[PDB]
Amino acid sequence: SWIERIKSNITPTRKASIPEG
Amino acid sequence: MLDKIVIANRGEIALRILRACKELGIKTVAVHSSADRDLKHVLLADETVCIGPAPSVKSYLNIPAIISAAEITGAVAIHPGYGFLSENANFAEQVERSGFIFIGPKAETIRLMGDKVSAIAAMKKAGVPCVPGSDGPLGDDMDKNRAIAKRIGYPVIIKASGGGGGRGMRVVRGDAELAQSISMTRAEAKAAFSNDMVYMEKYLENPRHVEIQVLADGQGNAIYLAERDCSMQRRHQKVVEEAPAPGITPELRRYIGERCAKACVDIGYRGAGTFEFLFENGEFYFIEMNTRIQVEHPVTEMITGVDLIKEQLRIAAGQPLSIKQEEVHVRGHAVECRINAEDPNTFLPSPGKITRFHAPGGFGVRWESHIYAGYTVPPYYDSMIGKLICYGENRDVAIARMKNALQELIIDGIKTNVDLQIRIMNDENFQHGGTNIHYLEKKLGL
Amino acid sequence: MLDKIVIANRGEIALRILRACKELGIKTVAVHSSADRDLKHVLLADETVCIGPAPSVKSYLNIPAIISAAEITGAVAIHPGYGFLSENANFAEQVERSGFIFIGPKAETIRLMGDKVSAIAAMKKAGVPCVPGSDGPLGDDMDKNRAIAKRIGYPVIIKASGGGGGRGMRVVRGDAELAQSISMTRAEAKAAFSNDMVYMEKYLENPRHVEIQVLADGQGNAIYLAERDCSMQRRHQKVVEEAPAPGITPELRRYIGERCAKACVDIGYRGAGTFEFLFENGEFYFIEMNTRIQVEHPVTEMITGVDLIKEQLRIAAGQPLSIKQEEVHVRGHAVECRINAEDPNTFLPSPGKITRFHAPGGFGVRWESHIYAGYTVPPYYDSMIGKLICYGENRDVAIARMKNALQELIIDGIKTNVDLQIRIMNDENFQHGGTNIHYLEKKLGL
Amino acid sequence: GHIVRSPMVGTFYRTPSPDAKAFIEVGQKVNVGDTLCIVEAMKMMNQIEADKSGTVKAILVESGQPVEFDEPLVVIE
Amino acid sequence: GHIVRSPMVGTFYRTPSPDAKAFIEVGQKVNVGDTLCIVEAMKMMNQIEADKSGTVKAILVESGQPVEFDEPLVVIE
Ligand SMILES: Nc1ncnc2c1ncn2[C@@H]1O[C@H](COP(=O)(O)OP(=O)(O)O)[C@@H](O)[C@H]1O
Ligand SMILES: Nc1ncnc2c1ncn2[C@@H]1O[C@H](COP(=O)(O)OP(=O)(O)O)[C@@H](O)[C@H]1O
Ligand SMILES: *C(=O)CCCC[C@@H]1SC[C@@H]2NC(=O)N[C@@H]21
Ligand SMILES: *C(=O)CCCC[C@@H]1SC[C@@H]2NC(=O)N[C@@H]21
Ligand SMILES: [Mg+2]
Ligand SMILES: [Mg+2]
Incomplete structure (x- = not known):
């Protein structure tokens, strides 16, 4: 079932740029 | 298309947005607090990020935390749902700064419509009728205030410009309590919204809260999808919402809807919004606009067949409107009932x-x-736990279906306001339809 | 309307009838066995009467018991639903003679259409094409039998006239085993339905089971409501239905619908019935007609918007059909999945x-x-525990919605065929559509 | 003790006639072979025979009240 | 079994610079307060100080791995 779910860690290789300013 | 989006909310709207995403094949990131790990959408989301402790000021109102979750998960949009930061212009511009897509209107649009003093002016400029009132913020010129009150006509209501959720409103019957009422309204506004500005408006005593739902893509197109009737309110907090509004003829419906669409075009609106009107004597009187998906929007979905959240996602993704005005057809009547988790006789969560x-x-x-069975409702957030929408070919069938579905519903272990909904459904005047905004408090009488 | 009716059934259909009755202001009498005192419709019904012990042959098939229950409670109608006594002409005639309205067709029409040979003959008379076959009950003239089989072309199938539920059917590839297959099928029919009559029909290897829904009030009026493609079957039992059938253009829809409505008018049909067919090369070949509301009617209800059981109740009360053929519009696409309490691999209850x-x-x-939580599924009855219908503006939206809904369903404490339904949903060919009636069995790769 | 229950569905009567004496009464005991009540179904007045002899402790139903299958009627101690 | 948990959502880094030395390693202990690791969010490198003096029992998250609020970072004693 979806109640007995174990959190799986995020994929590290995911980049989203944020402006320096 | 959007590769991935963050559902910066919780509860029922989070499920709605997650389920629309799943339908459209969009990857979902469900940001939650440390007490929300048990939420159904959190357990059904693809990726989950704990963004803060239990309190809302530290978890869901934390813009940096939500932006960081979007950044680490590599998302491209953020859906605020309703509540929290949905109508927050700072959130809009701060999300748009960092290259993320804000599923909703522009920051300037939220700023303009976010304060009623400016929204009323814009609507009057656009030809949408508005309630006669102060026509501007209230100052300390008491002589001017009383002259305005005499001109508009008593009774009068003082409403905070940044007010929301039904709070920060005081009804004044005469000059005796005008100053004290203004002072207390300003104090409550300072303590709640960090904005002490207030304005006075005429206090209609037999209106019907009728609101228009409009979809705009921000490219010169805008449509209106029927209306609603939220006249069943308690403490200005809606309880039963239904669409289409009984007694609103197709001529009046089109007359108000086309003007609302033109007004949307005027301000270059984007996404899904909602204009709130007071209906009396066949004349609509604008009061405020909601620049976000509305809690009661499912009633508009069940009579037109148009999924509003998927429309929001498509509009955010850049696609223009795929629905023409003539293609919108109202087929039936839907009645919704908010199921809160509170003591029915004391309205305490x-x-x-x-x-x-x-x-x-x-x-x-x-x-x-x-x-779900075994879900511990946390105390930190609002009391709403679900909505129940029943649809039929006419109002009577919808009401009968609602009465049947309210008995079949079981919620044990917590004090919920289901019996209040059952007794509202059985009320004879409600079955007649067209009751006014003050009817429910009169019925309860206390 | 009907003052009161008896729901001589159990399970989902009993709830469907109870809810339709409640919406219409009809009192309900829920007859149940001794093992069905915890059924939801029994606990929600106005009145409850125990009609017999646990086994079906003593409680839900005990016509005298149901008549007695209707008599003591002062009922004025009996709704059989589907299964049990829905297609029992003896039940219809006895109920009508005792002085209670039978919500369904006349006893004569049940007798006529139940006999598949007479049904095929009447369809041929009325202009409905039929599968080439024996054109009559099988005799002892083996020479004539083999001559007909050679003329139509092998393979051939032997089907019991009074058969049902996918049993009492045998496929014959050649003349070698024709006699033995016929004899054993006759013996099986004697054991099951107490009727050894059998007939032979041509066996189409790549058909698509398409069925039409027809509503006729018995006063010379009859309409057709789209179709349903029940191709996805295992062991001659449907698993996934959908409506409207993919690839059936509106021209073919109107064609077959007009023919079926004319047939209903000619044979004086009354109530709601379904005309099954086999679709291939753009031509339909009648196989049988169901003289009762079908398990997969919700898809038709959801695409057409016509509540079929309420229409049945209204027709039984004598009211003429208030829906014209031009007013029936198909808008969207519905996909239904049957959820059974059985091993997904051994298909045992x-x-x-x-x-x-x-x-x-x-x-x-x-x-x-x-x-519900705590319900104890008895072993004495069929293995179906519910149906799951999902509707969308097109086939793809409905299938995505179905995938989400199946992922969201929890049923523990028993073994349920939910994973099989998810697998069917994920099948690429099913998503493309147009699969033949034998696709599911071949999908198992055995 | 032993509870005899209606074997069918129908109206419960204790007097075989509108104005006559009851088949049995609370108190007075009964034997294995005896009729205790009437369960009318489709104007076919049926009779109920117990299986254990003993003293009739109480009659749990009243005349004219419809009963159902497996409905307790009379308890004999 | 004291656990120090990340105070913000971001990427977990060991070395303050991509080509520098690690802040800590299993074995070598840490005092009551000192830098222990780095979490970067929206740029703006943030250094996670330590609260308990003790031995670094273990470090559970590698460099470059995203961490959420109250993510178990290290175990000390
Ligand atoms: N001018 C008015 N006259 C009468 N009732 C009003 C007026 N303004 C607001 N209300 C009542 O308060 C409700 C909420 O008003 P609104 O301005 O939308 O405040 P909020 O921001 O708290 O929702 C309305 O639906 C209506 O019932
Ligand atoms: N002549 C035929 N050729 C091919 N398949 C058939 C034929 N007759 C029946 N079937 C298969 O069996 C299924 C059930 O047939 P039907 O006559 O409706 O029996 P039942 O009374 O058991 O439902 C059909 O949907 C079809 O898939
Ligand atoms: C047929 O129309 C029903 C008539 C019921 C007659 C019976 S005789 C025993 C019961 N006593 C009485 O007064 N009426 C019942
Ligand atoms: C921001 O622009 C993304 C990368 C910034 C450089 C930093 S130095 C520490 C991290 N290690 C690495 O290789 N890149 C990150
Ligand atoms: Mg409002
Ligand atoms: Mg069939």
Whole structure:
């Protein structure tokens, strides 16, 4: 079932740029 | 298309957005607090990020945390749902700074419509009728204030410009309590919204809260999808919402809707919004606009067949409107009932574990909620735990279906306001339709 | 309307009838066995009467018991639903003679259409094409039998006239085993339905089971409501239905619908019935007609918007059809999945208590079932515990909605065919559509 | 003790006639072969025979009240 | 079994610079307060100080791995 779910860690290789300013 | 989006909310709207995403094949990131790890959408989301401790000021109102979750998960949009930061212009511009897509209107649009003093002016400029009132913010010129009150006519209501949720409103009957009422309204506004500005408006005593739903893509197109009738309110907080509004003829419906669409075009609106009007004597009187998906929007979905959240996602993705005005057809009548978790005789929230739960089914019954048997309702957030929308070919069938589906619903372990909904459904005047905004408090009488 | 009616059934259909009765202001009498005192419709019904012990042959098939229950409670109608006594002409005639309206067709029409040979003859008379076959009951003239088989072309199938539920059917490839297959099928029919009459029909290897829904009031009026493609079957039992059938252009729809409506008018049909067919090369070949509301009627209800059971109740009361043929519009696409309490691999029933249960919900998802947390599925009856219908503006939206809803459903304490339904949903060919009636069995790769 | 229950569905009567004496009464005991009550179904007045002899402790139903299958009628101690 | 948990959502880094030395390693202990690791969010490198003096029992998250609020970072004693 979806109640007995174990959190799986995020994929590290995911980049989203944020402006320096 | 959007590669991935962050559902910066919780509860029922989070489930709605997650389910629309799943339908459209969009990857979902469900940001939650440390007490929301148990939410149904959190357990059904692809990726989950704990963004803060239990309190809302530290978890869901934390813009940096939500932006960081979007950044680490590599998302491209953020859906605020309703509540929290949905109508926050700072959130809009701060999300748009960092290269993320804000599923909703522009920051300037939220700023303009976010304060009623400016929204009323814009609507009057656009030809949308507005309630006669102060026509500007209230100052300390008491002589001018009393002259304006005499001109508009008593009774009068003082409404905070940044007010929301029904709070920060005081009804004044005469000059005796005008100054004290203004002072207390300003104090409450300072303590709640960090904005002490207030304005005075005429206090209609027999209106019907009728609101228009409009979809705009921000490219010169805008449509209106029927209306609603939220006249069943308690303390200005809606309880039963239905669409289309009884007694609103197609001529009046089109007359108000086309003007609302033109007004949307005027301000270059984007996404899904909602204009709130007071209906009296066949004349609409604008009061405010909601620059976000509305809590009661499922009623508009069940009569037009148009999924509003998927429309929001498509509009955010850049696609223009795929629905023409002539293609919108109202077929039926939907009635919604908000199921809160509170003491029915004291309207105080009642957190606690839900031991038993059985949602109703049937043909034309929609149950929109995140709860399940064994779900511990947290005390930190609002009391709403679900919505129940029933649809039929006419109002009577919808009401009968609602009455059936309210008995079939079981929620044990917490004090919930289901019996209040059952007794509202059985009320004869409600079955007649067209009741006014003050009817429910009169019925309860206390 | 009908003052009161008796729901001589159990399970999902009993709830469908109870809810339709409640919406119409009709009192309900829920007759149940001794093992069905915890059924949802029994606990929600106005009155409850125990008609016999646990076995079906003593409680739900005991016509005198149901008549007695209708008599003591002062009922004025009896609704059989589907299965049990829905297609029992003896039940119809006895109920009508005792002085209670039978909600369904006349006894004569049940007798006429139940006999598949007479049904095929009447269809040929009325202009409905039929599968080439014996054109009559099988005799002892083996020479004539083999001559006909050679003329039509092998393979051939032997089907019991009074057969039902997918049993009493045998496929013959050549003349070698024709006689033995016929004899054993006759013996099986004697054992099951107490009727050894059998007939031979041509066996189409790549058909698509398409069925038309017809509503006729018995006063010279009859309409057709789209179709349903029940191709996805295993062991001659449907698993996934959908409506309207993919690839059936509106021209063919109007063609077959007009023919079926004319046939209903000619044979004086009354109530709601279904005309099954086999589709191939753009030509339909009648096989049988169901003189009762079908298990998969919700898809038709959801695409056409016509509540079929309420229409049945209105027709039984004598009211003429208020829906014209031009007013029936198909808008969208509905996909239904049957949820059974059985081993997904051994397809054997798995009775037992349901420890937890959380039904799916959301926009455009109907969950029609009678189970709840703590319900003990008895072993004496069929293995179906609910139906799950999902509707969308097209086939792809409906299938995505179905995938979400199946992922969201929890049923523990028994073994349920939910994973099989998910697998069918994920099949690429099913998503493309147009699969033949034998696709599912071949999908198992055995 | 032993509870005799209706074997069918129908109206419960204790007097075989509108104005006559009851088949049995509370108190007075009964034997294995005896009729205790009437369960009318489709104007076919049926009779109920117990299986254990003993003293009739109480009659749990009243005349004219419809009963159902497996409905307790009379308890004999 | 003291656990120090990340105070913000971001990427977990060991070395303050991509080509520098690690802040800590299993074995070598840490005092009551000192830098222990780095979490970067929206740029703006943030250094996670330590609260308990003790031995670094273990470090559970590698460099470059995203961490959420109250993510178990290290175990000390
Ligand atoms: N001018 C008015 N006259 C009468 N009732 C009003 C007026 N303004 C607001 N109300 C009542 O308060 C409700 C909420 O008003 P609104 O301005 O939308 O405040 P909020 O921001 O708290 O929702 C309305 O639906 C209506 O019932
Ligand atoms: N002549 C035929 N050729 C091919 N398949 C058939 C034929 N007759 C029946 N079937 C298969 O069996 C299924 C059930 O047939 P039907 O006559 O409706 O029997 P039942 O009374 O058991 O439902 C059909 O949907 C079809 O898939
Ligand atoms: C047929 O129309 C029903 C008539 C019921 C007659 C019976 S005789 C025993 C019961 N006593 C009485 O007064 N009426 C019942
Ligand atoms: C921001 O622009 C993304 C990368 C910034 C450089 C930093 S130095 C520490 C991290 N290690 C690495 O290789 N890149 C990150
Ligand atoms: Mg409002
Ligand atoms: Mg069939």
